[PDB]
Write a protein that binds this ligand. Structure first.
Ligand code: NI
Ligand code: NI
Ligand code: NI
Ligand code: NI
Lengths: 211, 211
């Protein structure tokens, strides 16, 4: 299923895109309508076999350990749509893909926010309940806040070009959110609690750079 | 390195113990001083080779996927000392070991608490920072609160026989803790916030049972 939040960041002029976790290839198929050549990587065979008939090149494999059958500087964009939190070493994976990105190409990543009020309220209630879907999806094994997203990309030698915030309804939580913000201010806990606890996911464009 | 919090729960009268993540075998070696036969499982070869000269039986392998070379009802106790949070499917692993536990035998597990103030305060500050050691150890891929520990064991058909709470210094956090407790009471968020956010780890004895 496409993340509609990602498609709006796809540039029509891109020539080559790599979709990491391409599933059955629906996002790539959409991108291909622009003429862009789309490569995908998928770990589940049934999905990878569907993607093979839609995309230009598909690997059935694990990004964390696979050989990379691409040219240096092949890709305008490498997409991590709701992937990084499923990997054991996401930090290593973003460095691994870097040589395959063009000069001034980008990573486009959608990353769930662990500081979202829907995780923080139950945690205060004494719960960390894994679910079929959502922020505590049972297949999620890594967690990130915005600060940690920024650190991850910056330390891998990417610069942050764009940040898009995806919000969900949180009207019921507002009073709780305002009281918690009072405690952060009082206790000098960070900055941006209010701006960040309402963000469900971040879409980040990170441009290839150096340290 | 031994967890000194575990050794006090070892019964001298036990005849057979399985140490899951036995490392170099130091905990097992201590248990053996009682005459108890100790089996260990370790995933890192260098450690497993040291353990082999100390314990009665050692497997180099991954508990999640290995065949189990033990008899049914072999073990008085299966120890998970600071293991469960490192596994991809800890829920499945506790069911997997169950047939190898004696009637009225136990699992003894030490499990870090994600609701500890040292995780919750930085999370409010906008951080989820993985570390070399501690609650957000970079090799930790699962997180639990006390409620979730209880659910995990109960749903696998164990009964909870004993719970030991391991505390660390938190004097600097007390005012923050008291204010947060006020918010939980006000917002009807669970129960036991104050009792639980000061617990760094839990040691749980779970007795073999049924649903
Ligand atoms: Ni997911
Ligand atoms: Ni709002
Ligand atoms: Ni550990
Ligand atoms: Ni206290």
């Amino acid at each position: 299923a496409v993340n509609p939040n990602l498609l709006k960041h796809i540039k029509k002029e891109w020539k080559e895109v790599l979709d990491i976790g391409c599933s059955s290839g629906a996002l790539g198929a959409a991108i291909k309508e622009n003429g862009t050549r789309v490569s995908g990587i998928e770990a589940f065979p049934e999905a990878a076999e569907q993607a093979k008939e839609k995309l230009d090149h598909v690997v059935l494999g694990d990004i964390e350990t696979m050989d990379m059958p691409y040219e240096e500087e092949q890709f305008d964009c490498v997409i991590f749509g709701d992937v990084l939190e499923h990997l054991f070493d996401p930090w290593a994976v973003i460095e691994k893909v870097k040589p395959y990105i063009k000069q001034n190409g980008v990573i486009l990543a959608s990353i769930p926010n662990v500081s979202h009020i829907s995780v923080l309220a139950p945690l205060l209630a004494g719960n960390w309940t894994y679910t079929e879907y959502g922020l505590l999806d049972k297949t999620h094994i890594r967690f990130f806040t915005f600060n940690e997203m920024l650190r991850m990309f910056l330390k891998a030698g990417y610069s942050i070009s764009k940040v898009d915030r995806v919000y969900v309804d949180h009207k019921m939580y507002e009073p709780l959110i305002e009281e918690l913000y009072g405690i952060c201010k009082k206790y000098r806990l960070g900055s941006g609690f209010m701006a960040e606890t309402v963000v469900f996911q971040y879409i980040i464009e990170a441009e290839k750079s150096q340290l």
